[PDB]
Amino acid sequence: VQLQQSGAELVKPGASVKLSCKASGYTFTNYFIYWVKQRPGQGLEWIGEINPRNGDTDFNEKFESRATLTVDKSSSTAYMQLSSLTSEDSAIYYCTRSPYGNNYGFTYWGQGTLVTVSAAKTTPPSVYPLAPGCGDAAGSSVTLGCLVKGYFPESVTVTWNSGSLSSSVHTFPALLQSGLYTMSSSVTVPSSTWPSQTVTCSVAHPASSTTVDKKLEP
Amino acid sequence: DIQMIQSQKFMSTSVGDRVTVTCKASQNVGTNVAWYQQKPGQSPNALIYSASYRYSGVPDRFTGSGSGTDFTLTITNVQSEDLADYFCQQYNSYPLTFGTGTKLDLKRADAAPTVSIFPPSSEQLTSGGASVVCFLNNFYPKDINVKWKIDGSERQNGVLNSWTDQDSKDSTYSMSSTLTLTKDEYERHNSYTCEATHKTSTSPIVKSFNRNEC
Ligand SMILES: [Zn+2]
Ligand SMILES: [Zn+2]
């Protein structure tokens, strides 16, 4: 990953947020750094750009008054600060780049940072295993899962066996219930593998800085 | 002030077919247009630059064309891995602006849902909570209804129903239905059932357990 973005964050209404984006290798100064925003209903919106070589900037006029872009060449890191946040500033923010010479368009995008502007508190997920029980064997395959409940804000990343099982995986998007999120994840394995070949779900919740692993018990 | 207009929010096709994504700029932008692919749970991936040039690493079935104000992304040999949102962008003048996106869906044969049911976990129980979960897997088309019954009565409150994005391998959908209850209510009743009714059967696909057993 060439552009390493800070984790999802809950920000209180009217406070500021400072996001970071760390560039890789010895190539920091070969690029303009751009920030782009996506509110999952809308499209992408360009916020601003910075030159890492001197710190010069340019902005979408819509965002300029509340946005400060800086750089640390020593640590090869770009920063974006946004102030006086409203719910309209809840979105995912991408760090991107393009060649210093010509604007190809954005050649590489970071993973993005989901910012949630809310007065609520941060609440980590409880992870519940979904192990097969009284259900019929379902043929020759067995589907397992993990229920991820009671967290705020978004998002969570669920992986199975530290990234291994990642073709049989279904990831269900989170829904709100009582102000809190619930999502689930399932994985299908051949039924002959079950007892001894163990299966674990690992749930990262960036916003509360929490990681929970849960072994599914035979 | 330059608006990129993607008039199609949705496009449909079948595997092997072609699809054409259009993008209309409000002013001339020469050929300073880029196209991006964004798969679910991934950042955008740069596809096309300068209206018509393909990035090193991009399949030959992606072709961009156009000049001035009308731009087109053609995918001639659509695979199932091509499920994504596609969007254009102009970098002709500031501010950089993007179209609002077109999401590709794929047509395939109808297919029936496989159903798995899961009782509350012991951990959840000692915490004071009780959720019952049904996975309805790998069906098509998207439309599906789930009913929960507790000892034969319908329960509607507390049910969360969530669909995955279209499956990148087989173009099916899957769905999670969770019935949330208090622990006390859960430990009072016996029979818990999810019933899925889908076009591919007049008969409900059913999975059930008894708490008093299992
Ligand atoms: Zn699948
Ligand atoms: Zn009862």
Author numbering:
A (entry chain C): 1 to 218
B (entry chain B): 1 to 214
Quote the study on this structure.
HIT is caused by antibodies to complexes that form between platelet factor 4 (PF4) released from activated platelets and heparin or cellular glycosaminoglycans (GAGs). Here we describe and compare the crystal structures of PF4 in complex with Fabs derived from KKO and RTO and the structure of PF4 in complex with a heparin-mimic pentasaccharide, fondaparinux. NMR studies reveal that PF4 exists as an equilibrium among monomers, dimers and tetramers. Each monomer contains three-stranded antiparallel β-sheets on which an aperiodic N-terminal domain and an amphipathic C-terminal α-helix are folded.
In prior studies, we identified a murine monoclonal antibody (KKO) to PF4/heparin complexes that causes heparin-induced thrombosis and thrombocytopenia in a murine model, thus sharing salient features with the clinical disorder. Human HIT antibodies compete with KKO for binding to PF4/heparin, and KKO augments formation of pathogenic immune complexes.
